[PDB]
Amino acid sequence: PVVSTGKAWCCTVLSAFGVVILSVIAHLFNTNHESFVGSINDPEDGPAVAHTVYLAALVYLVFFVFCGFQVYLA
Amino acid sequence: FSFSHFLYYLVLIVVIVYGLYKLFTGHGSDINFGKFLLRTSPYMWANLGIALCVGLSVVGAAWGIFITGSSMIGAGVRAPRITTKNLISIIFCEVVAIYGLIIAIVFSSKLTVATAENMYSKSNLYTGYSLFWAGITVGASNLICGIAVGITGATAAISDAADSALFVKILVIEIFGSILGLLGLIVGLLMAGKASEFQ
Amino acid sequence: MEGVYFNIDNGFIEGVVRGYRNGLLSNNQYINLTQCDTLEDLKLQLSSTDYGNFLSSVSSESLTTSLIQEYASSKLYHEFNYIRDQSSGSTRKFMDYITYGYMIDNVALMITGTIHDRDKGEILQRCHPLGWFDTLPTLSVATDLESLYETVLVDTPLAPYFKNCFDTAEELDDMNIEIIRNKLYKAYLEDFYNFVTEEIPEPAKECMQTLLGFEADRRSINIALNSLQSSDIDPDLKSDLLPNIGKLYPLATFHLAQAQDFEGVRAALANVYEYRGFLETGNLEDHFYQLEMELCRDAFTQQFAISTVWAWMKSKEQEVRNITWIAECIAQNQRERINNYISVY
Amino acid sequence: EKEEAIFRSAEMALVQFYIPQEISRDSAYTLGQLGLVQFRDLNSKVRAFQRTFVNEIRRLDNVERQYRYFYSLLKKHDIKLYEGDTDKYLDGSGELYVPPSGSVIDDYVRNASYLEERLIQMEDATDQIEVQKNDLEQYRFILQSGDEFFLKGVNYVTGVIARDKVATLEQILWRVLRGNLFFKTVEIEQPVYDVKTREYKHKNAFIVFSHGDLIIKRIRKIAESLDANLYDVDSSNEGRSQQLAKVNKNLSDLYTVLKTTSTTLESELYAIAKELDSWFQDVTREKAIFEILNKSNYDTNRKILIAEGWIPRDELATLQARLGEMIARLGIDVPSIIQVLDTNHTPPTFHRTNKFTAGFQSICDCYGIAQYREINAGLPTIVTFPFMFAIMFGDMGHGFLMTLAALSLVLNEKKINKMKRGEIFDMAFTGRYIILLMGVFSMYTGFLYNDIFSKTMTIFKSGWKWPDHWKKGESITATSVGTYPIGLDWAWHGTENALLFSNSYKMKLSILMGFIHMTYSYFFSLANHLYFNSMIDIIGNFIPGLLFMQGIFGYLSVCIVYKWAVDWVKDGKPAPGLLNMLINMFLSPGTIDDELYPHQAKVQVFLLLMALVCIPWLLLVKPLHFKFTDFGDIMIHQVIHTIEFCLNCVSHTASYLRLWALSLAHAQLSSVLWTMTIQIAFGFRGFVGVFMTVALFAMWFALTCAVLVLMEGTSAMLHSLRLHWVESMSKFFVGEGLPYEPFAFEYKDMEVAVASAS
């Protein structure tokens, strides 16, 4: 608890990009786009990976609302 | 002492004794350098040509670039107006790697796939030999041209840092020395002119 | 060739020393320095050169010829120390070998001042700050030359040079110290010549060989012209002072070693072609300075060479000597011989 | 009504000033408060000490020197300089402040000259105390050592020496005492601050035992010759305690004397440190006025100073207004001090900037200051520089991040132009519109490449159609059911031959764009030669180069577009190779393997002989017209211009392969970064997969922002700069001229001026 201001923006900005990017990638997992799952490789199930990518978007959202109020104190 | 000369003398003695022994048996034609050229795959010669071409061109470019760049950085401490002027001496060393790129793009359009039947035909062996020697011709010429243009660029940077009126008279020598890579380019395009693909 | 592997370490050093070289004073700038009336005019005129803002933050009334030569020498010394810090390998060694020749002069000066019972701090200044060697002020103790050598000089880089100096074994006076110092500088020049012959590359090798040849020849002629003072010197005890390098050793240091009068030295130098233009005319020291500056000018035509450091060092020292002479002639109102500076550029 | 002067330079005037002596000092302030006159040096060939107004420089820079001594004394005994923020009663609207008049300058001179020696003796008084603080304090350290420091077989010396010389001490004393030394040392932990020098000097104590009298003088001279401070310490414990009690109440007395000796000095420095900057600004302005009056002719028959200066034409109505306001402030009668002069000198350049065209002008002026009334190269650079950036940086999302980074700097312009930053944020802020245009054009280019985060889009229907059925693992092909409207088709995404199409695609893109850029920049030479009334330069240089490079390299571009326009499978003809026929146009003329258009066996030979005959038609007309109106210098310079213009056609059009180059490599590195980090975390069901994709997206975003936007944007940015400095401005940009840089008043920034002197 020395300063903790120059590292607040580095996590709020990171989380602000992360929520939007993983949200749109999870929406593209859900509706089968045939470019994220359209080959014999990495995913097979479809919305079963959309599940955990929306979970990671929620975890980024709570990162964002935690660190976004610590920068508010300055 | 002198381990490299000991290696060279040992290789020389072993080669002389081996060839003299293959005479000694009466089997001097078992060292058959021509049958090695038939029975070796032509794609090896073609890909060594392309790779050694672009590699030696880039090595000559880098050599010239740091020779003129060290002297231009050193001479620009007192006179910092030499950098944007003698940028052209680094342009002249960078176009060497672009000549190597052009040769690699021309030669890589001839790397098709041949049949097991008539694999070692006359045209395929001709194509391998032509691509190999044309690639190393243009690559070694690009190496030497990059070295020479870099040396003249360092000397031109020092002379222009003396006063501004000298770089027009020394840049002419860089114009002389930069045509040699273009000579290597032309003759490398002409050696592989009649070579077909691999069919 | 020479331009191939040189720049890898020495290209920046060579470019910076050429940039230092472009600030050497030419003839018109010395004429403009000659036309100054007072000493503040000399300060303002030097301000528009490579020197400029060097006597800034001094004074307008504490300006003295000695202060001007102090600061003009300190600028030289800081530039040399920068170039010596930016080097490695053989160039670092070469610049240490440049330093050792001033270390020898500091040894001789400290011993000579110790004989006459002067102060440590008086001899510690005017003692040429480039040849320092940390254990230098300890030379003011224990007058006997052995009790210098077995205590402090063995750990200095001047240790392999006293291989001749232990012949006389008594307390020192002003002629013994000069015999010692001449033996030092002889062994020194031959060490540095055999260094250049084996490690320095070729276009710098020939230039450093001819510059060291001229250094040896100048000191040989000076010892031959100073040894005919009031003493008796065996030619065996004088030929151990003339270096075995130069263009007048194979046979012309022999007639210098066997010579009694001034005409003997004139007949000794009469067959060497570059010489015997010197003794039949005026200031005999200005001929050595002029020929040194012409050789140093000829050293700046080779580009991939570290002879440029030595040539620029000697040229900048001559430049400081010229500005000191002009400042003396201005400050003392002695304008009759002001044009006796030596300018080659 | 002022001309814009962004296409060309601004029109200049040379004006001769007839300034009387009694108002000359006052008039140069008014000439300096308007910053639009560049004075030329009329007193050339006159030595720097022989000029007029030299003692008025010596007095003023003596005052400057004493202010530098003061500010050096302010850094010691840390006191912040006040830096009076109102840099607006000298700048700003009105453009008129009354200069301080004579007695104020004499007050500055005598105030500083009185203040200097006072500060010198106050500083010298408080430094005789520190040099006797130091030895008493280190002697107090010597007096507390116990007995183990004083017990090993007066019979010893004791001192404090720096840590760098302890090994030298013991080496010498081992070689001097022959091996009977009992040297011993203990360290002083804190550094001991020096006054005679400024090194912090880690020191330690020592003690050396021996017996006799010529031995102790020997060890003593050897020790203090290496700058050691020797002392006298009693052998018994009680004498050491008496000495430690004696040094206290002497050293505490020195503590009491040090205060209220180093206090009045400090209060004087608190008085000086406020209102020093205003003194410094006034003296620098007063010195600049005489530096401008130094270059004017002095008359003796009448007291008139004659000065010349360059000026743009739209301010001759500003000169008369401001000088009329000056001669209305003080009551005189002077006869028309302004006269426009007709000259043959070279005027300055002066392009106008207005906050959007300023950064690109600073870009183009870094290479060279253009000739007077030459076409500015900073006007097409505004859009041709970020687009040639954008071809190499063809991504949607990376250009989107670059626009966000640019709008973080553009949306607060007023907050940032009042701060002190340093050399990196400066290049960030002065080129914010460059970064904005680069990001927007990179959005357009990355849309046309069909590439966002190394993925495709699928926003239209495709032009390719997959077959009806296939087994899992069959290599199939698509059937070309139309064309795709804007961009590359998204049916090229995996496809295992995407590079085979994309390389031959974007190489031809780069060659076409490079040729259009070169042939557009070449017409500025025609627009120059038509403006300077230089009709021999057209017929001698424009037509030969135009015919020579169009008939070789624009024919190649026409053949590329024509090969695109023709359907070769439906016509049943073999598609030729354009690289092969470009080589065989020069290296085997007349022979054609595959035909492109019907009568091309003769067009190759005609273009070859036209490009041939442009070689002796160049290098001949421009010198031999000078002959019949050769010289050697025009002839050799024209031979150099011919051997340099040719062989730069080939080299410069080969140099536009970098647009293909960096585009291909940016796409490949971004694709490997997508498939290397975040692609791993897509088959990891469980609670471990949540943290796995969290950490791997953090790593992926950090890499795609660090190595892939910042470190490949700087490269392609200075590649778009090389393509304009070398390949584009070697065709119209003539070169050397003198920049404008008028005489104006500025803030001076004291600590820069102290580093400028020292």
Swiss-Prot record, chain A:
GO molecular-function terms, A-Z: proton-transporting ATPase activity, rotational mechanism; RNA endonuclease activity
Keywords: Endoplasmic reticulum, Membrane, Transmembrane, Transmembrane helix, Vacuole
Lumenal side: 1-8
Cytoplasmic compartment spans: 30-52
Biological process terms in GO annotation: endosomal lumen acidification; Golgi lumen acidification; proton transmembrane transport; vacuolar acidification
Alphabetical list of InterPro entries matching this protein: Ribonucl_Kappa, RNase_K
Compartments it resides in: Endoplasmic reticulum membrane; Vacuole membrane
Any one GO cellular component localisation term in the record: Golgi membrane
One Pfam family it belongs to: V-ATPase_su_f
TM helices/strands, residue ranges: 9-29, 53-73
Membrane topology reported for the UniProt record: Multi-pass membrane protein
Summary of subunit composition and partner proteins: V-ATPase is a heteromultimeric enzyme composed of a peripheral catalytic V1 complex (components A to H) attached to an integral membrane V0 proton pore complex (components: a, c, c', c'', d, e, f and VOA1).
Biological function: Accessory component of the V0 complex of vacuolar(H+)-ATPase (V-ATPase), a multisubunit enzyme composed of a peripheral complex (V1) that hydrolyzes ATP and a membrane integral complex (V0) that translocates protons. V-ATPase is responsible for acidifying and maintaining the pH of intracellular compartments.
Protein name: V-type proton ATPase subunit f
Record organism: Saccharomyces cerevisiae (strain ATCC 204508 / S288c) (Baker's yeast)
Lineage: Eukaryota, Fungi, Dikarya, Ascomycota, Saccharomycotina
Swiss-Prot record, chain B:
UniProt keyword terms in alphabetical order: Hydrogen ion transport, Ion transport, Membrane, Transmembrane, Transmembrane helix, Transport, Vacuole
Cellular location(s): Vacuole membrane
Mode of membrane association: Multi-pass membrane protein
Superkingdom of source: Eukaryota
GO CC annotation: fungal-type vacuole membrane; Golgi membrane; membrane; proton-transporting V-type ATPase complex; vacuolar proton-transporting V-type ATPase complex; vacuolar proton-transporting V-type ATPase, V0 domain
Residue spans crossing the bilayer: 1-21, 48-68, 87-107, 131-151, 170-190
Job of this protein: Proton-conducting pore forming subunit of the V0 complex of vacuolar(H+)-ATPase (V-ATPase), a multisubunit enzyme composed of a peripheral complex (V1) that hydrolyzes ATP and a membrane integral complex (V0) that translocates protons. V-ATPase is responsible for acidifying and maintaining the pH of intracellular compartments.
Xref: InterPro entries: ATPase_proteolipid_c-like_dom, ATPase_proteolipid_csu, F/V-ATP_Csub_sf
SUPFAM superfamilies from the UniProt entry: F1F0 ATP synthase subunit C
Consequence the record notes for mutating E94D: Partial inactivation
Protein name: V-type proton ATPase subunit c''
Quaternary assembly: V-ATPase is a heteromultimeric enzyme composed of a peripheral catalytic V1 complex (components A to H) attached to an integral membrane V0 proton pore complex (components: a, c, c', c'', d, e, f and VOA1). The decameric c-ring forms the proton-conducting pore, and is composed of eight proteolipid subunits c, one subunit c' and one subunit c''.
Gene that specifies this protein: VMA16
Membrane topology, Cytoplasmic segments: 22-47, 108-130, 191-199
Sites annotated Essential for proton translocation: E94
From Swiss-Prot, chain C:
Principal cellular location given in the protein's record: membrane
Protein name: V-type proton ATPase subunit d
GO MF annotation: an example: proton-transporting ATPase activity, rotational mechanism
Known function: Subunit of the V0 complex of vacuolar(H+)-ATPase (V-ATPase), a multisubunit enzyme composed of a peripheral complex (V1) that hydrolyzes ATP and a membrane integral complex (V0) that translocates protons. V-ATPase is responsible for acidifying and maintaining the pH of intracellular compartments. This subunit is a non-integral membrane component of the membrane pore domain and is required for proper assembly of the V0 sector. Might be involved in the regulated assembly of V1 subunits onto the membrane sector or alternatively may prevent the passage of protons through V0 pores.
Pfam families for the chain: vATP-synt_AC39
Compartment list: Vacuole membrane
GO biological process: endosomal lumen acidification; Golgi lumen acidification; proton transmembrane transport; vacuolar acidification; vacuolar transport
Key word Kinase present: no
Gene Ontology terms: cellular component: fungal-type vacuole membrane; Golgi membrane; proton-transporting V-type ATPase complex; vacuolar proton-transporting V-type ATPase complex; vacuolar proton-transporting V-type ATPase, V0 domain
Family that this chain belongs to: Belongs to the V-ATPase V0D/AC39 subunit family.
Keyword terms: Acetylation, Hydrogen ion transport, Ion transport, Membrane, Transport, Vacuole
The organism of origin for this protein: Saccharomyces cerevisiae (strain ATCC 204508 / S288c) (Baker's yeast)
Modified residues (N-acetylmethionine): M1
UniProtKB/Swiss-Prot annotation, chain D:
Sequence intervals crossing the membrane: 375-393, 396-412, 427-456, 505-524, 543-563, 607-626, 643-667, 689-727
Effect annotated for changing F732L: Reduces assembly of V-ATPase complexes
Repressor among keywords: no
Reported effect, L723S: Reduces assembly of V-ATPase complexes
Record topological domains on the Cytoplasmic side: 1-374, 413-426, 525-542, 728-758
Pfam families: V_ATPase_I
Disulfide linkage: none
Segments on the Vacuolar side according to the record's topology features: 394-395, 457-504, 564-606, 668-688
Compartments it resides in: Vacuole membrane
Result for mutant: R658L: Reduces subunit stability
Effect of W725R: Reduces assembly of V-ATPase complexes
GO CC field: fungal-type vacuole; fungal-type vacuole membrane; membrane raft; vacuolar proton-transporting V-type ATPase complex; vacuolar proton-transporting V-type ATPase, V0 domain
Keywords: Acetylation, Coiled coil, Glycoprotein, Hydrogen ion transport, Ion transport, Membrane, Transmembrane, Transmembrane helix, Transport, Vacuole
MF (Gene Ontology): ATPase binding; phosphatidylinositol-3,5-bisphosphate binding; proton-transporting ATPase activity, rotational mechanism
PANTHER family: V-TYPE PROTON ATPASE SUBUNIT A, VACUOLAR PROTON ATPASES
Record note on quaternary structure: V-ATPase is a heteromultimeric enzyme composed of a peripheral catalytic V1 complex (components A to H) attached to an integral membrane V0 proton pore complex (components: a, c, c', c'', d, e, f and VOA1).
Protein name: V-type proton ATPase subunit a, vacuolar isoform
Source organism (scientific name): Saccharomyces cerevisiae (strain ATCC 204508 / S288c) (Baker's yeast)
Gene: VPH1
